[PDB]
Amino acid sequence: TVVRVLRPPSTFEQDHSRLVLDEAFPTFPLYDAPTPPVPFNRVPVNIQFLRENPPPIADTSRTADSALVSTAFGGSVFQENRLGETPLCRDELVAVAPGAAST
Amino acid sequence: DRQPLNPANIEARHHGVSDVPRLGAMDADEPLFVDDYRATDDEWTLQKV
Amino acid sequence: KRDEKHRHVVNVVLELPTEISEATHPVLATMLSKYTRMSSLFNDKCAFKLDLLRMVAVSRTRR
Amino acid sequence: SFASPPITVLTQNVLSALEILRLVRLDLRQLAQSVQDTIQHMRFLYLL
Amino acid sequence: RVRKRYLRQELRDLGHRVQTYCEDLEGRVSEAEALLNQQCE
Amino acid sequence: RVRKRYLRQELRDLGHRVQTYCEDLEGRVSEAEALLNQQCEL
Amino acid sequence: GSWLFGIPVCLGVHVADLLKGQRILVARHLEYTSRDRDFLRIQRSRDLN
Amino acid sequence: TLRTFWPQISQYDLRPYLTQHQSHTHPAETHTLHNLKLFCYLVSTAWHQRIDTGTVLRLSLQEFCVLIAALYPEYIYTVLKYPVQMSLPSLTAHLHQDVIHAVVNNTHKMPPDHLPEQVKAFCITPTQWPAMQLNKLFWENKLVQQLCQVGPQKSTPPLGKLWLYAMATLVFPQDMLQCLWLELKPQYAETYASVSELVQTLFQIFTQQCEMVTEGYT
Secondary structure: OOOOOOOOOOOOOOOOOEEEEOOOOOOOOOOOOOOOOOOOOOEEOOOHHHHOOOOOOOOHHHHHHOEEOHHHHHOOOEEEOOOOOOOOOHHHOEEEOOOOOOO | OOOOOOHHHEEEEOOOOOOHHHHHOOOOOOOEEEEOOOOOHHHHHHHHO | OOHHHHHHHHHHHOOOOOOOOHHHOHHHHHHHHHHOOOOOOOOOHHHHHHHHHHHHHHHHOOO | OOOOOOOOOOOOOOHHHHHHHHHHHHHHHHHHHHHHHHHHHHHHHHOO | OHHHHHHHHHHHHHHHHHHHHHHHHHHHHHHHHHHHHOOOO | OHHHHHHHHHHHHHHHHHHHHHHHHHHHHHHHHHHHHOOOOO | OOOOOOOOOEEEEEEEEEOOOOEEEEEEEEEOOOOOHHHHHHHHOOOOO | OOOOOHHHHHOOOOHHHHHOOOOOOOOOOOHHHHHHHHHHHHHHHHHHOOOOOOOEEEEOHHHHHHHHHHHOOHHHHHHHHOOHHHHHHHHHHHOOHHHHHHHHOOOOOOOOOOOOOOOOEEEEOOOOOOOOOOHHHHOOOHHHHHHHOOOOOOOOOOOHHHHHHHHHHHHOOHHHHHHHHHHOOOOOOOOOOOHHHHHHHHHHHHHHHOOOOOOOOO
């Protein structure tokens, strides 16, 4: 349900805001060639991910099913159709990209 | 009293807790109060002798 | 209310001297929490006196 | 300035529920002990 | 007759007091758990 | 005498029923608190 | 309304009100503009007949 | 969920998991709170390592934690799948502080200049942004109201709201409309199937509202 509607003002002043994380809860001290960074190219589409085992300190099908590559996420999804098959009906003018769409 | 005691009539004496109704009914006849304790047969013989 | 019943259980049943009060004994207050429950046995006051006596004894042991 | 009522409904803290349930547990134990003591008192006083 | 009468008021008092405790615990539980979803503001 | 005996028996009978029901409530509230503060297995 | 009237609109999901309400946190939900090839496609695919 | 239930999660202790080296037996259900606390702990240690280098904004742990969670959804999956030792360089390199400043200070601009690919969330200042009445262009305009005024009784509210529904259902392809009905269905229409059957039901109730009675004349 819609709660509010807003408009971007034409005025602007650069905020230059310095954000500080108020350390009300300091964390536990960190205790024991740099490793390559882990790519941020996977977004989950379900909730089953959190029920899995904790990461051991120091399956590809699981990556394919739940997580999804951000490259396919960021692009536009709706796709057109050509005339190769027998002239298409009203609902087949515009269609979703099968890769991006998910149940 | 007038009839042999059923097991239900023999109530347990536990200290520390107030247990006031027992102190009220000490003059009573029917209820018989025991420690949560029993004498072994050898101690039975020793006490008897 | 509660004041009359507690005054009874203090000065008629248990018959404490006036110099002993609620602020002097925590165990006595925690026991008066129980003693007010029963409206009977208010003739054999000796039983209540002995019960409070043994309650103090059990409260003061070092074990 | 707001006209519609905000902060309508959100879940509160769990600590208050936990402590109130602990008090309810203590009251249940006290109820059991008190009813047992009262029925035993009636048995010893009047049922003899 | 007096002792049986006293027994009957004591039994009625026990029933009334256990009902009072039941009602109090029910009310306290219902009031406390209603705040979990913050029905009141 | 006989009325007192039967009253004793039935009152002692109801005492343990009260105990069982209050322990059932004990277990239910304990399970509720457990499932609230920290979810357990199953 | 945006598609039928051919006007853009950006839909936002409110996350929470932070800093006593000084800022409103809205994640990127959905944006409409002639930039969107989907938007132009749906504008062209309308059957005004 | 993290914002609402933060006080309970915040007290979770992770010291035995991190300090101990060999794997210890852990309950299967306890993953949720432990994983969320681990993720927010990694967030906190990510922020604190890059503060070596107008208004100063103070952010608590939970607020910044949910903000950075919204910005990159890859944090949770990357943390769960990959260990902390290899996670720390990734979070250190990907924590673009200038992008964070731009997002937390993003205003006066919609849609934002940056693409949907790299970032998932932003922020809006309520004071700077005025509020219009977009209904006056969609369904509160004069012409649509006049077109939909025709109704059985004066108590009926304007039907332009339903009129735009009918036009969208009849004109636009069914694939788009079913895609939305699976995407952005309202709460009252959750049990309902699609837009066309919604029009069916609304027309049925409209016909039900008005009833007919026959009377004879002398």
